[PDB]
Design a binder for this molecule. Structure first.
Ligand SMILES: CCCCCCCCCCCCCCCCCC(=O)OC[C@H](CO[C@@H]1O[C@H](CO[C@H]2O[C@H](CO)[C@H](O)[C@H](O)[C@H]2O)[C@H](O)[C@H](O)[C@H]1O)OC(=O)CCCCCCCCCCCCCCCCC
Ligand code: CLA
Ligand code: CLA
Ligand code: CLA
Ligand code: CLA
Ligand SMILES: C=Cc1c(C)c2cc3nc(c4c5[nH]c(cc6nc(cc1[nH]2)C(C)=C6CC)c(C)c5C(=O)[C@@H]4C(=O)OC)[C@@H](CCC(=O)OC/C=C(\C)CCC[C@@H](C)CCC[C@@H](C)CCCC(C)C)[C@H]3C
Ligand SMILES: CCCCCCCCCCCCCCCC(=O)O[C@H](COC(=O)CCCCCCCCCCCC)CO[C@@H]1O[C@@H](CO)[C@H](O)[C@H](O)[C@@H]1O
Ligand SMILES: CCCCCCCCCCCCCCCC(=O)O[C@H](COC(=O)CCCCCCCCCCCC)CO[C@@H]1O[C@@H](CO)[C@H](O)[C@H](O)[C@@H]1O
Ligand SMILES: CC(C)=CCC/C(C)=C/CC/C(C)=C/CC/C(C)=C/CC/C(C)=C\CC/C(C)=C\CC/C(C)=C/CC1=CC(=O)C(C)=C(C)C1=O
Ligand SMILES: CC1=C(/C=C/C(C)=C\C=C/C(C)=C/C=C/C=C(C)/C=C\C=C(C)\C=C\C2=C(C)CCCC2(C)C)C(C)(C)CCC1
Ligand SMILES: CC1=C(\C=C/C(C)=C\C=C/C(C)=C/C=C/C=C(C)/C=C/C=C(C)/C=C/C2=C(C)CCCC2(C)C)C(C)(C)CCC1
Ligand code: OEC
Ligand SMILES: [Fe+2]
Lengths: 172, 35, 30, 64, 82, 37, 36, 34, 34, 340, 488, 36
């Protein structure tokens, strides 16, 4: 539903009927989003960290640049030369074209899976489900840390849309 | 030239590679603990 | 009352869109 | 400039800007109080946390 | 930047790597396995084995009640417990 | 009554101001609700 | 609608006080050329 | 007064001194071989 | 000396075989539901 | 010298940097990775949640988690050699412990690692700024793994160090703290989410405004690692969005900076928000509504309609989630709509 | 074009104008004290230290005037509930009329250090420029601190020169401000042990004086002064913000968990006091003694003291509040007017039952009456069509001992229920809500707020620490990266 | 004291809105010399 608290609703319900949170797709979704949001701060971090010279301390360091510059403002070599070093040296990017690219595709690819996640469970191929999947000898059941997930899930299933549901199975 | 086998780099790469296979074996082992 | 407060913000902001797009400081190619 | 009553009365204390003892000098005795300090906090934190016990020393509202 | 620490392709592609390792790698793979098979891993980390999570009759959970005389608890549970 | 040197001017350009305003107008729009309880 | 009483002075002042700051700092600068 | 807990701490301090101590010594050692 | 690709594929299959084991292992594995 | 020898050594290149920092980064950080790992593979978490937390027990990747200390301990650091465990690595492994471990050792890994970001940074003549941005997580990890728990009852209610066990951490908030409706958390997603776009866009926006300066179908090699030459026309930029979105990121110091801000900022707004949850100070409230929720039994907003979901999440999970309370809810007391 | 955050940098050098700065944030704070101080003072009600002690009224600043010792107002009343004895000038009003004049003058000393900004003292001899010696400057101020810290430690709290400090203990509470004797024995560390405080200040004072001298004399190694770039004031800021924020987190701890630095009555009862039925168990003992001592169960509870039942009311358990639940605990459950009586719920069979309380986490909650042994004998159904344990079908009932209800019993299924649901909150009470016009929802105690205060505050400051520390040390790269490249 | 509700936003805004104007116009002029 188009509105702020509406989304929250569309959500909490879903979890309940799709266990979305336990869905391999949404994962790869929260994956990139979190990533991009981390990379967005990474690549933004480095650049400004190897920014270059052009200012006083009174002046705003940001001023050191003109629209339509011919050469980039940052010192890429002194950047990779740092980041690369900070754990591994080779898990770093010298290939600005590649890096800026990595930024593109990561967020944009995970988000897709995600977009597909909803679209996947759209026809009921919900997230995983391990309720009662872990048991001992006698069969006495050992709750999986997912059984709680599911417990809190019922609390949701039950309430959502009280009055209409005129039958045992939320088949829709 | 002649670069040592006991490298800073190596101590690390090891602390990991030893357990990992120790673990992986442990796990592949569990794969059958029925009953 | 308070719903005007919501609508006043909502609006003066649409106009902060006006200025920031049309009376925005231009990109000077030098 | 513009000195005055206190301006002169306090000129020494502010004078020796760069006055710096040579080398590493005192440092060691710092690091000795330093670590000597840690255990203080830790020993306090740990009495408090309830990890360090003592007698007539059970941390509670009760305490008269 | 100028880098100079003993190369990788070298040894992953090295004749000696595969000969020292071939024998020792599965030594760990095997070692781990045994750790599980003996069933010591369990006693190693208290981790109960399916055969013994709940006593036979009881239906309750062996939950640690008091943080200070906890050691006892565990026992007295692991105790009556099979 | 002798001028202190450190009298540097202040800066906030035609744009930064648009953001500054977009920054407030928003939270204002966000918190308003919670400011009404 | 039973709502908080400072809603106006709260939300409102929240807008006009910081905003007025930025406003000041801009026209204070756009007036370096005496223009504005 | 040397409560099992207190003794627990000293023990902890000693282990702490041991890991730091062993660590620096080996460290000054290898740094010295260069 | 030993060709690089040849170490990759055999190293890989292991990950694909070991990982494969893990999926079987979830069906009869303790964590199954039987 | 004597110091500088230690310095001189540990300080220069050798591939995997190891610095004045490393001394605490590497050790804490290692144990930490291990700390979590061992648990998932071998350690159980039964004696605290009556819940299985190890491959060994049969748990899967998404199941395994390194518990969290029973509500009987509270915030006691639960020391291996402390009064509670008494250096009994099996009981200490049983009373959970590994938690405080993983968490505390870990807590340093960050402190330590950020330092490293400084060390390597002050040594390479760059702006530490990266190290700053990194507060983003410290604040989160601090508040969310230490502060919040420290504010509540026991280490128990603290995160779970699990895959699913951590998802529980969500719902549980939604259900009890109704976090979802907390301004602060909001900017928390306003920044992460907002930033991700910022990332995915600058990344691609750049790629396309790339000067063909290579020959053929491989614009990935055509780039010069060697010298200064704006690879992406900053001009073909603004004149693009300026016409497609109405706005132009004219400059790269700010663009490549504003990207630093977005996240880091929101995160903090999250860390604040949760700090709230520490002392149960939460945004569940919303009087204006609930007061009129009393009468007018026929007026309904999503807020309430949602808020109700929460109320179910409580009644059902609390009994099994919070075992140490031995909750008991008879068939009747449980809230349900007509049907199921 | 100098951007705003950079505008306060103006000074950095020129300590002259800076003094006038701190000379202000100082004349601006002091003011705020006397300020809200007056305010809270313009609203605190003394009428009853029993059910309307400050902390409920949403008092935040006046709670301290007690710690230190100001118990009363020039209007013949106190916070203990005294009579005839009225403090000297130094009574709430004073404390305020006080800081009010303070800030007021500092504002002047303030607008002085500006025009008169260039002084000899701020000018270094050998150097042709404005410089400030810090490596010593610091130790000096230190010397004053401890000198004072001790000057206070032994000369105030000990009661030797001045009033003690607020203290009491877990009964009543019967708190008051009495003199404290520093007890250095090991239990001086039981945060709770008040004595454990006077002992620390008298003791840390020593350690400060010595240090000051030491740092007023000794000079810093060129190995440190080169590392900690001393001389560049920028470093003293990260070198302090660091401690300040930590100083926070400690005040955040002492506040939330218990401590003799934050009492039980000057601040909302601790949220943990209710976690463990501290208040009901320390009660049952007394109503049990009184009981197995030859007394009517009635004389029994009518025995228990007002204030104490009250503590056993979840409505004071700091947690229950809400981040936006805008006010003083009173426009919540209302104004506590009195204790109704302990509500023991009887079965129809005669069996005694208990209302299974509401754990701090839930705003919502289903009442359940468990048999004295955890079994379930009563609840308030939701399905209600398959109810097996309804009050009505199990004939639940309620009697009352103590309070004002006393010796009375209620039988009608409605009220019996009701009384229960309100029992899930601890000790039932009678709240006048009309006067303030409460809402029916809980709020958090001062203790609650204060914690969340030196919370987000301290959690932020470490960011300043990380920011200035980083801008202290890299004041070099600060400008640009250095046009030169390629080596490394 | 039962008083009007807009007392604050009324009286208050009455102060800060026109006042802010004058404030602006001053520092907009005292900044001709770039000083201020
Ligand atoms: C933003 C920048 C971030 C920088 C990051 C830097 C990372 C570096 C990390 C180093 C420090 C982290 C590890 C510290 C662990 C300390 C262990 C602890 O917690 O110690 C454990 C104890 C807790 O005691 C509690 O006590 C409770 C009740 O006991 C007390 O009360 C009872 C009645 O209820 C009884 O009377 C009893 O006798 C009495 O002791 C319960 O038993 C609880 O289970 C128990 O945990 O705390 C104590 O004694 C110790 C005193 C507490 C000091 C707290 C300092 C700051 C953190 C706390 C803030 C929490 C509040 C936050 C508010 C919101 C924002 C801050
Ligand atoms: C509080 C008062 C005080 C202050 C502000 C100082 C300040 C100083 N002393 Mg000092 N000193 C004091 C009291 C004090 N001293 C006392 C009482 C004694 C005993 C008489 C000394 C004895 C002494 C000696 C011998 C020396 C000093 C020196 C110094 C200077 C060293 C520079 C420095 O601080 O970097 C050090 C900065 C740090 C160590 C910061 C690191 C701390 C962090 C990293 C801890 C980690 C945080 C972690 C998360 C918390 C763990 C706790 C947890 C387990 C609970 C500095 C100016 C040195 C000097 O050069 O003098 C001019 C020196 O040689 N002092
Ligand atoms: C210094 C810390 C501090 C603390 C712990 C308190 C605590 C308290 N004050 Mg208080 N007060 C303070 C400072 C403080 N005050 C100051 C500096 C002033 C002068 C402006 C006041 C003026 C004042 C008045 C007039 C009253 C109080 C009252 C109270 C009590 C009721 C709680 C409340 O009103 O909060 C309300 C809680 C909130 C509003 C929570 C959300 C509000 C903000 C913090 C959320 C947004 C923050 C920020 C703007 C977000 C933007 C960030 C940005 C990056 C976008 C409570 C004991 C009341 C009282 O008990 O009797 C008078 C009351 O009437 N205070
Ligand atoms: C602890 C005392 C303290 C002192 C004396 C300073 C002093 C300074 N800081 Mg600073 N800082 C601090 C704490 C402090 N800081 C903390 C705790 C943080 C992190 C939380 C920072 C983060 C920080 C950054 C990122 C920067 C500074 C900068 C500065 C310098 C100029 C910046 C400026 O004044 O902006 C002018 C301030 C304003 C225009 C005010 C507007 C900002 C908000 C919206 C005002 C809100 C406060 C006000 C409404 C009420 C205050 C209530 C109070 C309880 C906070 C100046 C030397 C700048 C610097 O020198 O460059 C490195 C700079 O860039 N600081
Ligand atoms: C959040 C993590 C963090 C990070 C990334 C930094 C980073 C920095 N701090 Mg710093 N600091 C921190 C937390 C942090 N600090 C805390 C919690 C305090 C307490 C006040 C300080 C106090 C402090 C001072 C006084 C100074 C700094 C300074 C600095 C800067 C120089 C490096 C330094 O001083 O040594 C880094 C120090 C450490 C990494 C501490 C080491 C951790 C301890 C010693 C290990 C022992 C803990 C123990 C074993 C744990 C057992 C747990 C037990 C309790 C159960 C650098 C930017 C300097 C500065 O910026 O001035 C220019 C400076 O003078 N800090
Ligand atoms: C989605 C969650 C998330 C993950 C897991 C993550 C992971 C990481 N982030 C890093 C960096 C960063 N993240 C940054 C901003 C952010 N990062 C974010 C979110 C994440 N960041 C968000 C919140 C912001 C957006 C900007 C900055 C920019 C950096 C850095 O530059 C840095 C980097 O350069 O990465 C390449 C790397 C630093 C590695 C390191 O310090 O190891 C060394 C020491 C460590 C990590 C030991 C810690 C031990 C402690 C944490 C014990 C914890 C153990 C449990 C948590 C494990 C449980 C596992 C679960 C399955 C339960 C890497 C660890
Ligand atoms: C395509 C790749 C490209 C990039 C994305 C790839 C995403 C792949 C995601 C797979 C992750 C989970 C694997 C499936 C779980 C499973 O099924 O294996 C389990 C343990 O797993 C595991 O132990 C997961 C291993 C991950 C540990 C990583 C630690 C990081 C340190 C590594 C350092 C290396 C130097 C073992 O089985 C479990 O335990 C068994 C008991 O033996 C039970 O019977 C069940 O089968 C239960 O599932
Ligand atoms: C629902 C409404 C309520 C909430 C608000 C809505 C959120 C909107 C998100 C925009 C925030 C990001 C700011 C852009 C970065 C930037 O462009 O920043 C400056 C201002 O631009 C702006 O933003 C101008 C703000 C108005 C743009 C929104 C117009 C909406 C109509 C779009 C319809 C398209 C068919 C532009 O240049 C900036 O400032 C320049 C100096 O003048 C520098 O040189 C740099 O270029 C720097 O980027
Ligand atoms: C309900 C409501 C109104 C809001 C919800 C609550 C809100 C609004 C919270 C916001 C409060 C805060 C501070 C949130 C976090 C702060 C923050 C910076 C978040 C990031 C999101 C944000 C503020 C703006 C998003 C920016 C964005 C997505 C796009 C603008 C940048 C952009 C156009 C990039 C594309 C782009 C790339 C490029 O390379 C070139 C050359 C040009 C010209 C471009 O335009
Ligand atoms: C705890 C402990 C410790 C240590 C530890 C350790 C040693 C740990 C470990 C370890 C480790 C170190 C572990 C881990 C790791 C690893 C691994 C074993 C992994 C994994 C897995 C897997 C399964 C994977 C998979 C994959 C990958 C790898 C990626 C991609 C995808 C795939 C699937 C292929 C200490 C001393 C502190 C203390 C005592 C105890
Ligand atoms: C006649 C005179 C005078 C006058 C006056 C005075 C004194 C005063 C004043 C006043 C004052 C003294 C003032 C003020 C104050 C206040 C302040 C200074 C503040 C405030 C507030 C603030 C700052 C804030 C905060 C906040 C907010 C804003 C809201 C939210 C929350 C927070 C916290 C964020 C005197 C007496 C001096 C004497 C001399 C002369
Ligand atoms: Mn809106 Ca899909 Mn649950 Mn049946 Mn309704
Ligand atoms: Fe970039």
């Amino acid at each position: 539903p188009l509105g702020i608290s509406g989304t929250f609703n569309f959500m909490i319900v879903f979890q309940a009927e799709h266990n979305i949170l336990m869905h391999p797709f949404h994962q790869l979704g929260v994956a990139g989003v979190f990533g991009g949001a981390l990379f967005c701060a990474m690549h933004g971090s480095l650049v400004t960290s190897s920014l270059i010279r052009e200012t006083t301390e009174t002046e705003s360091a940001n001023y050191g640049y003109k629209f339509g510059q011919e050469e980039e403002t940052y010192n890429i070599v002194a950047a990779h030369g740092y980041f690369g070093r900070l754990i591994f040296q080779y898990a770093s990017f010298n290939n600005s074209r590649s890096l800026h690219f990595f930024l593109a595709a990561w967020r944009v690819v995970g988000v897709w899976f995600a977009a597909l996640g909803i679209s996947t469970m759209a026809f009921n191929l919900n997230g995983f489900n391990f309720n009662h999947s872990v048991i001992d000898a006698k069969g006495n059941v050992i709750n999986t840390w997912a059984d709680i997930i599911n417990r809190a899930n019922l609390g949701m299933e039950v309430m959502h849309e009280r009055n209409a549901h005129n039958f045992p199975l939320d088949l829709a | 030239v002649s670069y040592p086998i006991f490298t800073v780099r190596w101590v690390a790469v090891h602390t990991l590679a030893v357990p990992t296979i120790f673990f992986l074996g442990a796990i592949a082992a569990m794969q059958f603990i029925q009953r | 009352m308070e719903t005007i407060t919501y609508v006043f913000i909502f609006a003066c902001i649409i106009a902060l869109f006006f200025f920031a797009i049309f009376f925005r400081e231009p990109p000077r190619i030098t | 400039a513009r000195r005055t009553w206190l301006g002169d009365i306090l000129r020494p204390l502010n004078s020796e800007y760069g006055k710096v003892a040579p080398g590493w000098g005192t440092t060691p005795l710092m690091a000795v109080f330093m670590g000597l300090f840690l255990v203080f906090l830790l020993i306090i934190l740990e009495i408090y946390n309830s990890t360090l016990i003592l007698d007539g020393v059970n941390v509670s509202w009760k305490a008269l | 930047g100028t880098t100079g620490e003993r190369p990788f392709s070298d040894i992953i592609t090295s004749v000696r790597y595969w000969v020292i390792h071939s024998i020792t790698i599965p030594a760990l793979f095997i070692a781990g396995w045994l750790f599980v098979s003996t069933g010591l891993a369990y006693d190693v980390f208290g981790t109960p084995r399916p055969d013994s999570y709940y006593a036979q009759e009881q239906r309750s959970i062996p939950l640690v009640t008091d943080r200070f005389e906890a050691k006892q608890q565990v026992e007295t549970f692991l105790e009556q417990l099979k | 009554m002798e001028p202190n040197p450190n009298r540097q001017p202040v800066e906030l350009n035609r744009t930064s101001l648009y953001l500054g305003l977009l920054l407030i107008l928003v939270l204002a729009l966000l918190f308003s609700s919670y400011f009404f309880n | 609608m039973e709502v908080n009483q400072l809603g106006f002075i709260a939300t409102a002042l929240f807008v006009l006080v910081p905003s007025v700051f930025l406003i000041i700092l801009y026209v204070q600068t756009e007036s370096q050329q005496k223009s504005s | 007064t040397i409560t099992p807990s207190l003794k627990g701490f000293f023990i902890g301090l000693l282990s702490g001194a041991v890991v730091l101590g062993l660590t620096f010594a080996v460290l000054i050692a290898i740094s010295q071989i260069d | 000396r030993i060709p690089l690709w040849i170490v990759a594929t055999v190293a890989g299959m292991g990950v694909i075989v070991i990982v494969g084991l893990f999926f079987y292992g979830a069906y009869a594995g303790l964590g199954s539901s039987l | 010298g004597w110091f500088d020898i230690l310095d001189d050594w540990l300080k220069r290149d050798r591939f995997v940097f190891v610095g004045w920092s490393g001394i605490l980064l590497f050790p804490c950080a290692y144990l930490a990775l291990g700390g979590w790992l061992t648990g998932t593979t071998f350690v159980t978490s039964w004696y605290t949640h009556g819940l299985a937390s190890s491959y060994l027990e049969g748990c899967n990747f998404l199941t395994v988690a390194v518990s969290t200390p029973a509500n009987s301990m509270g915030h006691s650091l639960l020391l291996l050699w402390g009064p509670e465990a008494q250096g009994d690595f099996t009981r200490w492994c049983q009373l959970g412990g590994l938690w405080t471990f993983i968490a505390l050792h870990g807590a340093f890994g960050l402190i330590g690692f950020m330092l490293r970001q400084f060390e390597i940074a002050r040594l390479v003549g760059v702006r530490p700024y990266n190290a700053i941005a990194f507060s983003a997580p410290i604040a989160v990890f601090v508040s969310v793994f230490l502060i919040y728990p420290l504010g509540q009852s026991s280490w128990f209610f603290a995160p779970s160090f699990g895959v699913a066990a951590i998802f529980r951490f969500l719902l549980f908030f939604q259900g009890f703290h109704n976090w979802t409706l907390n301004p602060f958390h909001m900017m928390g997603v306003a920044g992460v989410l907002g930033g991700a776009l910022l990332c995915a866009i600058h990344g691609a926006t750049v790629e396309n405004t790339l000067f063909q300066d290579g020959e053929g179908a491989s614009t990935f090699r055509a780039f010069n690692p060697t010298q200064a030459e704006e690879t992406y026309s900053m001009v073909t930029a603004n004149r693009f969005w300026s016409q497609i979105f109405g706005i132009a990121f004219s400059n790269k110091r700010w663009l490549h900076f504003f990207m630093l801000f977005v996240p880091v900022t929101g995160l903090w707004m999250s860390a604040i928000g949760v700090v709230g949850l520490a002392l149960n100070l939460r945004s569940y409230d919303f009087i204006s509504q609930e007061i009129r929720a009393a009468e007018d039994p026929e007026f309904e907003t999503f807020y309430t309609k949602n808020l109700l979901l929460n109320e179910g999440i409580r009644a059902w999970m609390a009994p099994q989630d919070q075992p140490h309370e031995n909750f008991v809810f008879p068939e009747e007391v449980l809230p349900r709509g007509n049907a199921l | 074009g100098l951007p705003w955050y950079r505008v306060h940098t103006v000074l950095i050098n020129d300590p002259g104008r800076l003094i006038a700065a701190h000379l202000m944030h100082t004349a601006l704070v002091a003011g705020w004290a006397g300020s809200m101080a007056l305010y809270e003072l313009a609203t605190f009600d003394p009428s009853d230290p029993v059910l309307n002690p400050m902390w409920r009224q949403g008092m935040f600043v006046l709670p301290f005037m007690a710690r230190l010792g100001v118990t009363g107002s020039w209007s013949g009343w106190s916070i203990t509930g005294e009579t005839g004895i009225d403090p000297g000038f130094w009574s709430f009003e004073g404390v305020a009329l006080a800081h009010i004049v303070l800030s007021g003058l500092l504002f002047l000393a303030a607008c002085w250090h500006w025009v008169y900004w260039d002084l000899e003292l701020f000018r270094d001899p050998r150097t042709g420029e404005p410089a400030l010696d810090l490596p010593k400057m610091f130790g000096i101020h230190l010397f004053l601190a401890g000198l004072l810290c001790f000057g206070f430690g032994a000369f105030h709290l000990t009661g030797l020169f001045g009033p003690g400090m607020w203290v009491s203990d877990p009964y009543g509470l019967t708190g008051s401000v009495q003199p404290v004797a520093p007890e250095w024995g090991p239990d001086g560390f039981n945060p709770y042990n008040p004595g454990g405080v006077v002992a620390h200040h008298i003791a840390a004072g020593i350690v400060g004086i010595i240090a000051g001298l030491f740092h007023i004399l000794v000079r810093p190694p060129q190995r440190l002064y080169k590392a900690l770039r001393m001389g560049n004031i920028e470093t003293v800021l990260s070198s302090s913000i660091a401690a300040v924020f930590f100083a926070a987190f400690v005040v955040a701890g002492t506040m939330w968990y218990g401590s003799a630095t934050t009492p039980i009555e000057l601040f909302g009862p601790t949220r943990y006091q209710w976690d463990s039925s501290y208040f009901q168990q320390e009660i049952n003992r007394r109503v049990q003694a009184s009981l197995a001592s030859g007394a009517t169960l009635e004389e029994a509870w009518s025995a228990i003291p007002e204030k104490l039942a009250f503590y056993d009311y979840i409505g004071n358990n700091p947690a229950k509040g809400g981040l936006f639940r805008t006010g003083p605990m009173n426009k919540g459950d209302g104004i506590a007017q009195a204790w109704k009586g302990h509500a023991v719920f009887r079965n129809k069979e005669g069996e005694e039952l208990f209302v299974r309380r509401m754990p701090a986490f839930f705003e919502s909650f289903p009442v359940i009456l468990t048999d004295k042994n955890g079994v379930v004998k009563a609840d308030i159904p939701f399905r209600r069509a398959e109810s097996k344990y309804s009050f009505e079908q199990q004939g639940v009932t309620v009697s009352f001992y103590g309070g004002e209800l006393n010796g009375q019993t209620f039988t009608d299924p409605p009220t019996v229920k009701s009384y229960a649901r309100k029992a899930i909150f601890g000790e039932i009470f009678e709240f006048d809500t009309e006067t303030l016009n409460s809402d029916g929802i809980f709020r958090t105690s001062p203790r609650g707020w204060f914690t969340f205060a030196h919370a987000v505050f301290a959690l932020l400051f470490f960011f300043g620490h990380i920011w200035h520390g980083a801008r202290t040390l890299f004041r070099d790269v600060f400008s640009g990266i250095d046009p030169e490249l390629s080596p490394e």
